[PDB]
């Protein structure tokens, strides 16, 4: 039984990591779209065309 | 009288062996019941620690 317990712990830890992981990107996308602007957009295009 | 003694003598020797076989039969069957009970309880012990 003592190894089944450990397998359950690993599985629960993984599901928690998965949830936090996808909420991180959802939040980052909302922050981005609420905070992108022309001054930064022009700087991004400038960066990538400087190494295009 | 020799042969009449031999009658009961072979009776007792064969009957001793026969009952000595039935006792060992009971031995094995009781072993099996003992072991199955021990195992069926150990499984619920495992399940207790698992649920904890």
């Amino acid at each position: 039984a003592q190894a089944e317990i450990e397998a359950e712990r690993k599985r629960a830890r993984e599901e928690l990591r998965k949830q936090v992981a996808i909420l991180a990107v959802a939040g980052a996308e909302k922050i981005i779209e609420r905070s992108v602007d022309e001054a930064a957009n022009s700087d991004i295009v400038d960066k990538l065309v400087a190494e295009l | 009288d020799l042969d009449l003694a031999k009658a009961s003598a072979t009776d007792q020797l064969k009957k001793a062996k026969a009952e000595a076989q039935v006792i060992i039969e009971q031995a094995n069957k009781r072993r099996s019941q003992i072991l199955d009970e021990a195992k069926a309880e150990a499984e619920q012990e495992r399940t207790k620690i698992v649920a904890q």
Side-chain angles (χ1 to χ4, degrees):
Chain A
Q2 209 62 10
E4 197 292 326
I5 290 163
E6 172 55 25
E8 184 73 350
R9 293 189 180 199
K10 273 186 170 78
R11 188 174 291 95
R13 180 174 172 286
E14 166 59 3
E15 171 50 29
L16 186 51
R17 186 196 134 275
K18 190 59 46 57
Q19 286 175 17
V20 55
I22 70 183
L23 292 186
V25 297
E29 177 260 323
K30 289 176 179 175
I31 288 161
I32 286 276
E33 68 98 337
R34 193 171 173 101
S35 313
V36 286
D37 47 38
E38 294 71 35
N41 185 31
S42 55
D43 220 4
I44 295 160
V45 300
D46 279 320
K47 170 166 174 172
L48 71 99
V49 305
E51 57 93 27
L52 171 62
Chain B
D1 60 331
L2 183 71
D3 303 347
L4 81 86
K6 186 52 54 68
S8 61
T10 190
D11 165 46
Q12 276 168 99
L13 190 56
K14 288 169 180 166
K15 190 174 60 62
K17 288 184 178 183
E19 302 304 333
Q21 288 309 125
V22 85
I23 181 174
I24 291 181
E25 176 270 355
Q26 186 259 359
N28 282 266
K29 299 321 92 161
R30 178 42 33 177
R31 164 179 87 256
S32 301
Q33 288 118 33
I34 268 288
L35 200 154
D36 301 342
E37 282 180 44
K39 162 261 200 172
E41 179 52 32
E43 183 147 28
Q44 281 161 340
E45 178 75 336
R46 132 178 162 164
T47 301
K48 278 181 178 182
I49 174 57
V50 162
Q52 194 287 333

